[PDB]
């Protein structure tokens, strides 16, 4: 039960085709008629879209006839289901549009909720919808270092959504390249957290948020288009933050948030907790609740690690329809200056500080490293505050010749800059 031919499918108005591709599953979709969207991004008719290693809905705004090709699906297996909660997304979107249009500046919204309530899907959809009717450029702010969006994992980020997302990509789209592309790409501001979970170093996590908030403010001050559009701030699971929600307080202050969106039932203890804690600061009129979003499903860590791997590959080499050429170089041990953040595992208590790394295969082989703008000779306090230039991958550490093979996204020389060891590993 496989097959490599095209198959016709009609999706009813208001239904999702729920797709779940696992690993090496490859799906091609071609729309014949109607309107379908992937997290608010409209598929063009007669154009082929290719998907891989992703779990996502294709939503029918109108009754849609399409053609699909995939050896790992059959007509008797595909899942099509009515979605009853889109109206909540529309109501919220058009309220926000009203603020972008009439208020002195655009709304700055934080989205909060439990594990897999649909915070990131809501964010993506609202960003897509913001482009559609009045050509806004909202800032998408990702505060979940486990979700790779426009960059590699381990980062928080701010990115203006200045043109359509790539409906093919779980990563939403890509950052700028040196050549010609089918879609206009994005220009993100990225801060390196570097660790696998925020509880490995809460202090450093909050440090990154403060650094992002400062440069986000500098952008909004200089950019009237983005300022009028506002910000969509996406957070990690609420269960990952502290009991008293003091991390949310910090996010709200550093990013100048004025609207809060909570994903939960009016009877979840979270609802009253949020009103009691943030109501005196934001005003209860500016705290909204969305019930369960339909279709949203739980993900395991196998699935999260799979999106992370794909995002690392994409950073260096591009995607299926955007082939990029990264650059491999050999360097000596003496050519590299590498630091490592404090963490609970290595240092028992995570602080805002870095320690020097001694070059070993066990330490560095297969590691993603952040490249800063700081001199090699820069002190630790300078390196901590230094903006991120990009990322590199150490594919081989030869102990006997005292040399490394390093992969760069940009062809040319190894940057003469201070670098920071990440917890992420990638084998080609």
């Amino acid at each position: 039960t496989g097959d490599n031919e095209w198959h016709k499918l009609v999706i009813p108005k208001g239904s999702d085709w729920q797709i779940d591709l696992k690993a090496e599953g490859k799906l091609i979709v071609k729309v014949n008629s109607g309107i379908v969207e992937i997290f608010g991004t409209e598929l063009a008719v007669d154009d082929e879209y290719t998907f891989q290693n992703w779990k996502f809905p294709i939503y029918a705004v109108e009754e849609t006839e399409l053609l699909w090709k995939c050896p790992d699906l059959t007509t008797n297996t595909i899942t099509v289901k009515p979605n009853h909660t889109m109206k909540y997304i529309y109501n919220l979107h058009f309220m926000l549009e009203k603020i972008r249009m009439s208020n002195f500046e655009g709304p700055r919204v934080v989205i909060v909720g439990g594990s897999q309530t649909g915070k990131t899907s809501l964010s993506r959809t609202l960003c897509s919808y913001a482009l559609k009717f009045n050509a806004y450029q909202p800032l998408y702010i990702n505060l979940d270092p486990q979700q790779p969006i426009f960059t590699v994992p381990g980062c928080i980020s701010a990115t203006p959504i200045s043109d359509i997302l790539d409906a093919q990509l779980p990563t939403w789209g890509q950052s700028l390249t040196s050549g010609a592309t089918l879609l206009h790409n994005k220009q993100p501001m990225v801060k390196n957290f570097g660790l696998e979970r925020i509880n490995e170093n809460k202090d450093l996590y909050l440090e990154c948020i403060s650094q992002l908030g400062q440069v986000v403010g500098q952008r909004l001050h200089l950019d009237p288009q983005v300022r009028r559009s506002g910000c969509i701030v996406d957070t990690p699971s609420i269960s990952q933050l502290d009991e008293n929600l003091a991390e949310l307080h910090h996010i709200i202050e550093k990013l100048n948030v004025n609207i809060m969106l909570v994903l939960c039932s009016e009877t979840d203890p979270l609802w009253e907790k949020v009103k009691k804690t943030f109501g005196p600061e934001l005003g209860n009129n500016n705290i909204f609740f969305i019930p369960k979003l339909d279709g949203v499903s739980a993900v395991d860590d196998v699935y999260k690690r799979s999106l992370q791997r794909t995002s690392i590959r994409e950073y260096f080499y591009g995607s299926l329809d955007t082939a990029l050429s990264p650059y491999a170089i050999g360097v000596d041990y003496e050519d590299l200056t590498i630091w490592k953040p404090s963490n609970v595992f290595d240092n028992e208590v995570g602080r805002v500080e870095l320690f020097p790394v001694t070059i070993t295969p066990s330490n560095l082989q297969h590691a993603i490293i952040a490249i800063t703008f700081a001199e090699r000779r820069a002190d630790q306090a300078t390196v901590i505050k230094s903006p991120i230039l990009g990322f590199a991958l150490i594919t081989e550490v030869n102990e006997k010749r005292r040399k490394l093979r390093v992969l760069l996204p940009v062809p040319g020389r190894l940057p003469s800059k201070a670098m920071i060891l990440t917890s992420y590993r990638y084998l080609e």
């Binding site: 952008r219 200089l222 650059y327």
Partner: peptide, 25 residues
């Protein structure tokens, strides 16, 4: 035969002053 690559990111000061209309126009 022609090739392209990923770009480095912009510094804080260059990103703050950057206009996405440069990308899209």
């Amino acid at each position: 035969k022609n090739i392209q690559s990923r770009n480095w990111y912009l510094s804080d000061s260059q990103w703050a002053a950057f206009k996405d209309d440069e990308i899209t126009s």
